[PDB]
C-alpha cells in the first residue's frame, strides 16, 4: 500500500545547471508549502529529487467547497475527485487558488511530471475480477470512475457498450457468411442499420452516464492551456497566425497521401505479380500487404509524432480545442494508413485494373481478392496491435526501512502517461473496419468481438502495470471521436454498398449508392425519433421538481353601472328576459 | 378608444334551451369574480350577452409575480404579457391558480370566443407607419411583440428576414435569366447554397430573438389542452388508441394522393391536347392548369378542414403536440396540392411522356414547357391568394365590439404555411423560371403589409402566446431545402438533355450537405449569447508505525530545504 502520498513530482536535476536547479527546487518547495501541501523530499534514480506531496484538512475542505460551488456555477452540479482537486491546486496559477508549478510554462522547468501513485492492492483485485468474469456490470465502471477518473471510465464504458453491440453484427455476419454468400446487399443494409443504432444508443448511454456521474456540462467549461503562448492581453493570439500555421496541414496531408498511396500501389502491384507468376504451395500472395500492416504501427507512429509537432506550433488557448485538433489530425492519419489499401483494392483495382499494367511491367482481375485482403486487414493488424500493446511490454519489463516503497516509486516514474486517445483511436478504427469493409469478409466483426473481450482486460492491464496512473479528468462526452464515429458510419453506408455492386459483377452503382445513403439517413432519423420517444432525464426532472417545491368621463362611468354581484346578476337576468 | 376593457366574454344565449343558460351565466360570473376580475354585462348581437372583464391591482401583481417565479423555475427567465396573464387567469382551472371557464371542456359551453379588444389608434398608426416605409427596423417587430404577443412577432420577424434574404435569389435569378439561358446548373447550386444560408441564419436569428424577448425555452413548458379526454388518472390516455387513430391518416393520405393525382393527370392531358390541337392566335395552352391553381384554395381548403377533424378525434395531451400534428398534416396536404402538378410535369411527363397517350386518345415532347408552367405556378397562385386575403352614451364602442366578435380568430399557421410553400417553390422549382424569386420578392413586400392589415381590421386580436421559435416549420423548411437541392439538379439534367441524372443528384445532394456543415460551422464560429454569458458572469459574482514516521522525518519547510540541499550535494 502507499504511504499516504497523494501526488508525486519528479524534479530531475542534471549534473550541470545545478546553480539554478537549487533555486528552482527551493521555489517549488516554497510554493507547495504556501498552497498548503505537506512535502517530503527523497533521492531518486539518475540524480533526481523525488518530492511527495499530500494535504491541513480544513484547506482541502475549503478547496472542495470552492470547486463544488464552481461546478454549481456552470450547471454541472471519492479518490478521483480528491486527486483532481489536489492536481488543480498544484497546477493552477496564483491568480485562482493555486501555485502554478507546471513544467512547460513558467521557470519551474526542471520538473518532468506530476503524477499520483498506483494502488497495487486495488489493481490486482481489479485485474482478477475482470479476468474471472464474462461480462462487466455497471458497478465495475463505477469503480473505475471512482478510482481513475471520468475519462478512463468513459473509455471503458464505451468499450463495453461497443463489445456488447458487436454481438448483433457478428451474429448476422456469421449468418450471411454461412448462407447468404459473398457480398450480400442485405448484410450491408443490416451493417448500416446496426452502425446507426449503436451510435445513437451510445449517445443516449453517454448522456445517462454523464448525468449519473455528475459530469453533465464539463465540456462547456473552458480550461486554459499552461503552455499557450500569447502576444497581447485585453491572453489573446492573432487568429491570422493560427490560420497560417493550420494551412501547413494541407501540404502535409497531401504529402502523406502521396507517400502512402505510392507505397500501397507498389505493394499491391508486387502482390499481384507474385500471385500471377509464382505458384507457391495461396498464402504467400498476400505476404507483401501483411508486411505493410506490420509496418503500419511504425511509419504511422512517426507520423503521429509529426502531428504532435504540427500541434505544437499551432497555438491553442483551451485544452479542449487543442485535444480536438490533435484527435482530428490523428484520426485523419490513421484513417489513411489503415483504409487506403482497402479503398485502392475496392475502388481502383476492381473497377478499372487496367492502370497498374506499367507497374506489373516494372517487376518483370479476381473479384474475390477484396474478401481475402479484408480478412488479412482484420486479423493481422489486431495481432500486431496485441503484440505492440500487451506482450512487447511484457518482454520489456522481463528484461528489467522504507526501501520497497521508494523503489516502487522510482520504477513507477519511468513509465509513460496513459494516453486514452490511442485506445479510442484503435476502437474507432475497428468500428470503421466493421462499418465500411466487413461486407467483403462478414466474419470480421466476429473476430473483432473476441478481440474486444481481450481488450477490455488487456487495456485494463495496460493501466495496471504497463503505465503510470493518469491524472483524473472530467469529460461529459468521449469528445470529437463521436463525430469520427458518425463519419465512419455515413461513408460506410456508401462504401459497403459500392463493394456489393462492384464485386458481384455504371448506373447501377450510383443507384445502389443512392439507395444505401438514403436508407442510412432514413434509419438515422427513425432511430433518433425512437430514442427521443424513450433514467437520467427522469432524475433531472425529479431534481427540478424538488428544487421547485423547495423554492416556496365615459370610462369612469362605464364600470360603475353594475359594480356589485347582485346588480350584475339582476341586469343579466333582466336582459335575458328582455330577449 | 377602449373603456379599460381587458377581455370580452361572448356567452351567446339561445332562445331554445334557456333553462340551463341562466345557471351557466351565473356560474360564469361567480367564477370570474372569484378569480378577481371586475365584470360588466352588456347587450350582444343575435341573442347574446357580452360581459367585459378587467382587473384589484394587488391580485394582478400577485399573479404577475407568480408567473415570473414560474418562468424563473423552468429556466426561461407590456400589454401582451398582461393580456396573456389575464387569459391564463380566465382559462386555468381553479385547482391551480385560476377559474376554468374554457369554452370546450366543461359544461360552460355557451361561450364561443375568448378575445380581447383591438386598439384602433394603434392599428391605424401601425398601418400608416408600415405603408410609408421601405424597410422595417427591429423597433417595429419589438412593438409587434409588445402589442400582439410573441407568436405574431415571430411570424413577422420571419417574414421580414426571409423577404430580406430573398433579394439574392432575385439578383442571381435575374442574372441567370439574362445570361445563363435556361436550366443553369450554377443557378441550382446558388439556390441550394442560399437555402442553406437562409435556414441557418434564421435559426441564429430565432435564438437571438428568443434571448432578447425573454422567451428562450418556452417550448420546453408543456401546456395541457382543455379539450384533452382521458380515461384514467395516475390524466392518462391509452397510447394504443392514439396510434389506432393516427393510422387513419395513411388511407386518407393515399386517397388524397390518388384523387389529386388523377385531377392533375387529366388537366395535364387536356392542356397537352389543346396545345397539340388548338391553333389560337399561345396563352390558352396553360388555361387548364391556371384554373387548377384557381381551384387550389378551395379543395385544399376543405382538405385542411378534414385534417383538423382528423386532429380532433386524434386526442392530444399537450398543446405543442396537437399543434405539431396539425402543422404536419397541413404541410403534407399543401405540399401535395401545390407541388405535385409540377412534379408530374418535371419527373413524369418530361422523362417519359409516352404514358399520357391513352388520356390524349380519350380526349380525342416540349422540354421548355415546364418553365412556362413554373411561370403559371408563380404569378397566379399569389394573385388569387391576394383575392383570398384582402380583396375578399356608449353606443359606438358597443357597436364596435359587436362588429368585432363576428370576425374570425387570427391563425398564424396559415401565413406560416403560405410562406413555407413560397420558400419551397423557390428552393425546388425556381430553376425552371429563375425570375420567380423576383416576383416572390415583390409579393413579400406586399405581404408584410397585407398580412398586417389582415390583423388590423379583418380579424380579431389574437391571444398573446409566447413561443420559443416558429415551431415545427423549421423541419418543413429543412425538408424543402433538401428536396430542392435534389429537384433542381434533376430538373436541370432532365431539361438540358440515365446515368448522368444519378451523378448530378449525388453531386447536388452532397454539395448541399457539405455547405450545410460549412455554414453551421461558420455560424458556430460567429449577440444574445454574449448577453447570456454576461448575465451568467454577474450571477457568478453575486453568488459568492512507519506510515506516520514517513512524514515526520521533515516536519517543517526549512528542514525539508536543508535535506533537499544535502541530497543535492550527495549526487
Ligand atoms: Ca488491442
Ligand atoms: Ca487498446
Ligand atoms: Ca398572400
Ligand atoms: Ca399571408
- What SS3 string covers A436-488? HHCCCCCCHHHHHHHHHHHHHHHHHHHHHCCCECCCCCCCCCCCCHHHHHHHH
Give bridge partners of residue A39 from the DSSP assignment: A53
Q: After which residues is chain B broken (C to N over 2.5 A)?
A: 55, 77, 234, 281, 364, 392, 497, 526, 544
Alpha-carbon span B211 to B532, nearest angstrom? 8
SS3 B291: helix
CB contact under 8 A, A40 and B550: yes
Task: List, in order, residues 6 or more apart from B80 with CB less than 8 Å away.
Answer: B145, B146, B147, B148, B149, B150, B464
In total, chain A counts a number of residues equal to 579
The three grid cell numbers given for residue B541, joined into one nine-digit string: 459574482
| H or E element that contains B9 | strand B7-9
Alpha-carbon span A173 to A179, nearest angstrom? 10
**Owner of C-alpha cell 392514439:** B242
Alpha-carbon span B395 to B400, nearest angstrom? 9
Measure Cα distances from B427 to A93, A137, B368 in Å.
55, 52, 19
Alpha-carbon span A466 to A422, nearest angstrom? 14
Residue B528: closest CA among B262, B216, B221: B216
Measure Cα distances from A362 to A289, A353, A356 in Å.
18, 16, 10
Alpha-carbon span B394 to B408, nearest angstrom? 24
Angle between helices B249-277 and B287-312 (to 10 degrees): 170
Alpha-carbon span B50 to B111, nearest angstrom? 10
Size of interface A-B (CB pairs under 8 A): 117
Measure Cα distances from B426 to A528, B200, B202 in Å.
29, 17, 16
Alpha-carbon span B447 to B439, nearest angstrom? 12
SS3 B289: helix
Contact residues on chain A for B4, CB-CB shorter than 8 A = 555, 558-559
| H or E element that contains A503 | helix A481-504
Residue B462: closest CA among B529, B392, B404, B512: B404
Question: Taking a C-beta distance cutoff of 8 angstroms, is the pair A265, A288 a contact?
Answer: no
CB contact under 8 A, A43 and B499: no
Alpha-carbon span A243 to A237, nearest angstrom? 11
Alpha-carbon span B482 to B474, nearest angstrom? 12
Query: In a 10 Å sphere around its CB, with 0-12 CB exposed, 13-18 middle and 19+ buried, how is residue A8 labelled?
Result: buried
CB contact under 8 A, A21 and B69: no
Q: How many angstroms separate the CA of residue B41 from the nearest CA in chain A? A: 6
Measure Cα distances from A441 to A267, A505, B479 in Å.
21, 17, 37
Secondary structure tally for chain A: helices H, strands E: 23, 4
Phi-psi region of A11 (alpha: psi -120 to 50; beta: other; left: phi over 0): left
CA A185 to chain centroid: 31
**For residue B85, how far is its CA from the centre of ligand 4 (angstroms)?**
28
The three grid cell numbers given for residue A578, joined into one nine-digit string: 328582455
**Owner of C-alpha cell 464515429:** A485
Task: List, in order, residues 6 or more apart from A64 with CB less than 8 Å away.
Answer: A81, A82, A85
Residue B25: closest CA among B128, B85, B109: B109
Give backbone dihedrals phi and psi of B398, rounded to 5 degrees, phi first: -65, -40
Alpha-carbon span A322 to A319, nearest angstrom? 5
Alpha-carbon span B319 to A101, nearest angstrom? 58
Alpha-carbon span B148 to A501, nearest angstrom? 59
3-state helix, strand, coil in chain B (%, to 5): 70, 5, 25
> Measured between CB atoms, which of A38, A73, A559 is closest to B551?
A38
CB contact under 8 A, B540 and A565: no
DSSP state of B43: E
Give bridge partners of residue B52 from the DSSP assignment: B8, B40
Question: Taking a C-beta distance cutoff of 8 angstroms, is the pair B40, B52 a contact?
Answer: yes
CB contact under 8 A, B393 and A554: yes
**For residue A455, how far is its CA from the centre of ligand 2 (angstroms)?**
6
Residue A317: closest CA among A379, A218, A238: A238
Question: Taking a C-beta distance cutoff of 8 angstroms, is the pair A441, A374 a contact?
Answer: yes
Alpha-carbon span B211 to B205, nearest angstrom? 10
DSSP state of A388: I
Task: List, in order, residues 6 or more apart from A333 with CB less than 8 Å away.
Answer: A256, A300, A303, A304, A307
The three grid cell numbers given for residue A402, joined into one nine-digit string: 522504507
The three grid cell numbers given for residue A257, joined into one nine-digit string: 497521401
Alpha-carbon span A468 to B241, nearest angstrom? 59
Domain boundaries, chain A: 7-117, 128-534
Within a 10 A sphere around the Cβ of B534, how many other Cβ atoms? 10
* DSSP track, A241-272: HHHHHHHTHHHHHHHHHHHHHHHHHHHHHHHH
Alpha-carbon span A1 to A24, nearest angstrom? 31
Measure Cα distances from B309 to B228, B236, B244, B252, B312 in Å.
14, 22, 15, 12, 5
3-state helix, strand, coil in chain A (%, to 5): 70, 5, 25
**For residue A484, how far is its CA from the centre of ligand 4 (angstroms)?**
44
CA B374 to chain centroid: 25
Give backbone dihedrals phi and psi of B114, rounded to 5 degrees, phi first: -125, 95
CB contact under 8 A, B551 and A42: no
Give backbone dihedrals phi and psi of B52, rounded to 5 degrees, phi first: -95, 130
Which residues of B belong to the annotated binding site for Ca(2+)? 385, 389, 415, 418, 447, 451
Taking the alpha carbons at both ends of chain B, their separation in whole angstroms is 97
CB contact under 8 A, B40 and A568: yes
CA torsion, ordered A372, A377, A378, A382, to nearest 10 deg = 140
Q: What residues are neighbours of ligand 2 (ion), with CB under 5 Å? A: A 423, 426, 459
Residue B115: closest CA among B21, B44, B52, B46: B52
Alpha-carbon span A52 to A5, nearest angstrom? 6
Alpha-carbon span A283 to B462, nearest angstrom? 79
Picking from B9, B16, B41, B511 by the largest number of A CB atoms within 10 A of its own CB, the best residue to mutate is B41
H runs (alpha helix) in A345-443: 357-363, 369-386, 392-399, 403-412, 420-437
Task: List, in order, residues 6 or more apart from A211 with CB less than 8 Å away.
Answer: A535, A536, A537, A539, A540
| H or E element that contains B115 | strand B114-115
Nearest Cα residue in chain B from A2: B547
CA B186 to chain centroid: 31
Amino acid at each position: 500500500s502507499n504511504f499516504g502520498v497523494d501526488f508525486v513530482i519528479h524534479y530531475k536535476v542534471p549534473a550541470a545547471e545545478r546553480d539554478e536547479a537549487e533555486a528552482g527546487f527551493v521555489q517549488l518547495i516554497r510554493a507547495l508549502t504556501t498552497v498548503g501541501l505537506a512535502t517530503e523530499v527523497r533521492h531518486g534514480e539518475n540524480e533526481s529529487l523525488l518530492v511527495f506531496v499530500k494535504v491541513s484538512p480544513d484547506l482541502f475542505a475549503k478547496q472542495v467547497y470552492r470547486a463544488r460551488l464552481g461546478d454549481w456555477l456552470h450547471g454541472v452540479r471519492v479518490e478521483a475527485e480528491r486527486l483532481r482537486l489536489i492536481y488543480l491546486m498544484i497546477t493552477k496559477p496564483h491568480n485562482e487558488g493555486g501555485a502554478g508549478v507546471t513544467p512547460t510554462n513558467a521557470k519551474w522547468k526542471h520538473v518532468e511530471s506530476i503524477f499520483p501513485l498506483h494502488s497495487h492492492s486495488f489493481n490486482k483485485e481489479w485485474i482478477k475480477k475482470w479476468s474471472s468474469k464474462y461480462t462487466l456490470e455497471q458497478t465495475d465502471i463505477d469503480n473505475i470512475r471512482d478510482k481513475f477518473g471520468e475519462s478512463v471510465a468513459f473509455y471503458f464504458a464505451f468499450l463495453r457498450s461497443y463489445f456488447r453491440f458487436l454481438v448483433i453484427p457478428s451474429a448476422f455476419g456469421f449468418g450471411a457468411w454461412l448462407l447468404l454468400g459473398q457480398f450480400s446487399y442485405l448484410y450491408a443494409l443490416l451493417c448500416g442499420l446496426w452502425s446507426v443504432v449503436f451510435f445513437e444508443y451510445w449517445k443516449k448511454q453517454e448522456v445517462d452516464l454523464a448525468v449519473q456521474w455528475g459530469v453533465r456540462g464539463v465540456s462547456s467549461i473552458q480550461q486554459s492551456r499552461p503552455e499557450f503562448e500569447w502576444e497581447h492581453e485585453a491572453k489573446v493570439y492573432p487568429p491570422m497566425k493560427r490560420v497560417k500555421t493550420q494551412l501547413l496541414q494541407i501540404p502535409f496531408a497531401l504529402a502523406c497521401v502521396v507517400a502512402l498511396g505510392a507505397l500501397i500501389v507498389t505493394c499491391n502491384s508486387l502482390e499481384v505479380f507474385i500471385n500471377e507468376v509464382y505458384s507457391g504451395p495461396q498464402y504467400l500472395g498476400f505476404l507483401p500487404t501483411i508486411f505493410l500492416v506490420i509496418g503500419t504501427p511504425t511509419i504511422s507512429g512517426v507520423l503521429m509524432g509529426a502531428a504532435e509537432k504540427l500541434n505544437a506550433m499551432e497555438n491553442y488557448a483551451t485544452v479542449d480545442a487543442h485535444d480536438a485538433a490533435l484527435i482530428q489530425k490523428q484520426f485523419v492519419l490513421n484513417f489513411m494508413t489503415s483504409y487506403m489499401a482497402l479503398f485502392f483494392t475496392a475502388f481502383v483495382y476492381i473497377p478499372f485494373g487496367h492502370i497498374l499494367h506499367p507497374f506489373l511491367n516494372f517487376w518483370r482481375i479476381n473479384p474475390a481478392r477484396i474478401s481475402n485482403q479484408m480478412f488479412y486487414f482484420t486479423v493481422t493488424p489486431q495481432i500486431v496491435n496485441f503484440a505492440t500493446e500487451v506482450v512487447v511490454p511484457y518482454i520489456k519489463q522481463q528484461a528489467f526501512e522504507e526501501a520497497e516503497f521508494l523503489q516502487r516509486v522510482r520504477e513507477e516514474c519511468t513509465l509513460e502517461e496513459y494516453d486514452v486517445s490511442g485506445d479510442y483511436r484503435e476502437m474507432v478504427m475497428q468500428f470503421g473496419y466493421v462499418a465500411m469493409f466487413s461486407v467483403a469478409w462478414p466474419l470480421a466483426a466476429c473476430c473483432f468481438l473476441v478481440n474486444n473481450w481481450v481488450e477490455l482486460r488487456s487495456d485494463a492491464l495496460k493501466i495496471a502495470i504497463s503505465s503510470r496512473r493518469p491524472i483524473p479528468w472530467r469529460t461529459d462526452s468521449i469528445g470529437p471521436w463521436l463525430t469520427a464515429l458518425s463519419f465512419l458510419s455515413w461513408l460506410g453506408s456508401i462504401t459497403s454498398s459500392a463493394i456489393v455492386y462492384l464485386c458481384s459483377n455504371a448506373w447501377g452503382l450510383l443507384l445502389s449508392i443512392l439507395f444505401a445513403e438514403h436508407f442510412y439517413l432514413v434509419v438515422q432519423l427513425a432511430v433518433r425519433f425512437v430514442l427521443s420517444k424513450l433514467p437520467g432525464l427522469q432524475k433531472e426532472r425529479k431534481e427540478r421538481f424538488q428544487t421547485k417545491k423547495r423554492l416556496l368621463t365615459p370610462e369612469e362611468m362605464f364600470w360603475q353601472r353594475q359594480r356589485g354581484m347582485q346588480e350584475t346578476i339582476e341586469i343579466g337576468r333582466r336582459m335575458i328576459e328582455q330577449q
